[PDB]
C-alpha cells in the first residue's frame, strides 16, 4: 500500500483502514486528522512522534497459542502482528474509553499510551502476564 | 379441474381484472412470461429443443 498525504506514513493509512467502517475512508480520515490536531493542541508536540511512541508502548512482544484440557503456550509474536495488534487494541479500547467523540477517544488513548497508561497497555501486560505464567509450557 | 379453467381463462370474463395468463400448451398459471406466454418449464423444453429464437443459455 502507500503512506498518507499530510504526514507521509504507512501506519496512519493502515490505521485508517482499520478504523474505517463500511468503506468510509474519508470519515475515518477526518476523525484521525482531527485527533492529530487535538493531540497537537493538548500535549504540544508532533502527532506522529506521540503516536509512534504510543504504539511502541502498547505493541507487544509475546503471544500465546491455545492447544492441547487446553494449554496456552507462549510464542514470539511476528513483527507484522505486532503493529496489527497495537493498532487494533488502540482503536477498540478507544471505542470503549467511552466519551463523546471518537477523535477525543483516540487522542486520549494515544496520550495515555504515550505515557505508558491506558487500556491498551493493560492488555499488553495482561498478555505478557499470562504468557510468562504459562512459560513452563514453551 | 384444469381444462375447464383453461376454457375459462380463454373466455372473456365479466370484467377485465379477472383476466389471468397461463401457458397455452400447459395450463399452468404461475411462472408465466407474458412475452412468450410460456411457463418456465415449457420455456426450457422449447429453448433446449431450439424452437425459440434469440435464446441461448448465458454466461
Amino acid at each position: 500500500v502507500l503512506p498518507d498525504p499530510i504526514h507521509n506514513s504507512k501506519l496512519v493509512t493502515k490505521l485508517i483502514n482499520k478504523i474505517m467502517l463500511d468503506g468510509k475512508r474519508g470519515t475515518a480520515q477526518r476523525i484521525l486528522y482531527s485527533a492529530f490536531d487535538l493531540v497537537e493542541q493538548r500535549s504540544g508536540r508532533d502527532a506522529l512522534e506521540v503516536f509512534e511512541e504510543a504504539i511502541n508502548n502498547i505493541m507487544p512482544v509475546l503471544e500465546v497459542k491455545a492447544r492441547r484440557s487446553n494449554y496456552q503456550v507462549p510464542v514470539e509474536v511476528r513483527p507484522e502482528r505486532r503493529t496489527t495488534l497495537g493498532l487494533r487494541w488502540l482503536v477498540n479500547y478507544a471505542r470503549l474509553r467511552g466519551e463523546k467523540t471518537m477523535e477525543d477517544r483516540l487522542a486520549n488513548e494515544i496520550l495515555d499510551a504515550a505515557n505508558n497508561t491506558g487500556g491498551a497497555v493493560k492488555k499488553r501486560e495482561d498478555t505478557h502476564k499470562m504468557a510468562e505464567a504459562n512459560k513452563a509450557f514453551a | 379441474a384444469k381444462t375447464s379453467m383453461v376454457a375459462k381463462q380463454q373466455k372473456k370474463q365479466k370484467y377485465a381484472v379477472r383476466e389471468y395468463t397461463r401457458c397455452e400448451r400447459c395450463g399452468r398459471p404461475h411462472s408465466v412470461y407474458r412475452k412468450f406466454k410460456l411457463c418456465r418449464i415449457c420455456f426450457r423444453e422449447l429453448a433446449y429443443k431450439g424452437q425459440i429464437p434469440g435464446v441461448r443459455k448465458s454466461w
Binding site: - | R34, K35, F36, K37, L38, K49, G50, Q51, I52, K57
Partner: protein, 208 residues
Amino acid sequence: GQKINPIGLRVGIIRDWEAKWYAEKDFASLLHEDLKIRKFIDNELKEASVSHVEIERAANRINIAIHTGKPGMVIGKGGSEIEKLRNKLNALTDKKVHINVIEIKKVDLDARLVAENIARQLENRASFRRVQKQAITRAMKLGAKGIKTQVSGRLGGADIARAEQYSEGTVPLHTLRADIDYAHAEADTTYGKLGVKVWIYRGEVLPT
C-alpha cells in the same frame, strides 16, 4: 447426475435455432403458431420418419423445411400430399406457406429416427437389449465416431424400473465443438412408459 440436453447447450454455438425468424413484439402469437405446426405434423410424423422441421417467416410467406428419409410418403408421387398439407395447414395458419421436403440419407445415423424405431420395436414387444445392440451396430457400420443409447422404465414387464444403457465410441458431452445429436422418445408399453434416449456423434464440423 441430472445432466442437461446438449442441443440446449450448443444452440447458438455450432447449431442454430430451428425457428429462424424475428419478431420484436408478436412472439405471443408466432411461437404458438410454430408449436401448432410442430404438433400438426403428427400426420406425417406418425410414419414418415421426419427428424426435424426448420421454420422461417417473412412478410408475405412462411417457408418451412421438413427433413426425412422417406420423403415419398410426404410428397405422394407428384405433389398430392404436399398440396393436401398446404390446404389444411394454411387453413389453420391463415398465411401463405411454402414447404420444402428435404432428404437426410443414412436414416440409421439420426438420433430421433433411431429413437422412433426402438420405441416402435418396444411397442411390438422386442428386447431392449437386442434393440440397443443392433442400433449401435448399424450406426458404427455407417461410420459414426460415437453412439450412446439408454432406455428406462419397466423392462421385461418387471414390477419395478431400471435404466440400461450401452455405448461404443466417444460421446464427449462437455466438448462444445462436438455436434452430438441427442433425441428422446417414449413408448407406451402395455405395462407403462419406456423412455428412450439416444446420442450420436458423427465427427466434427462448425457452422461458420
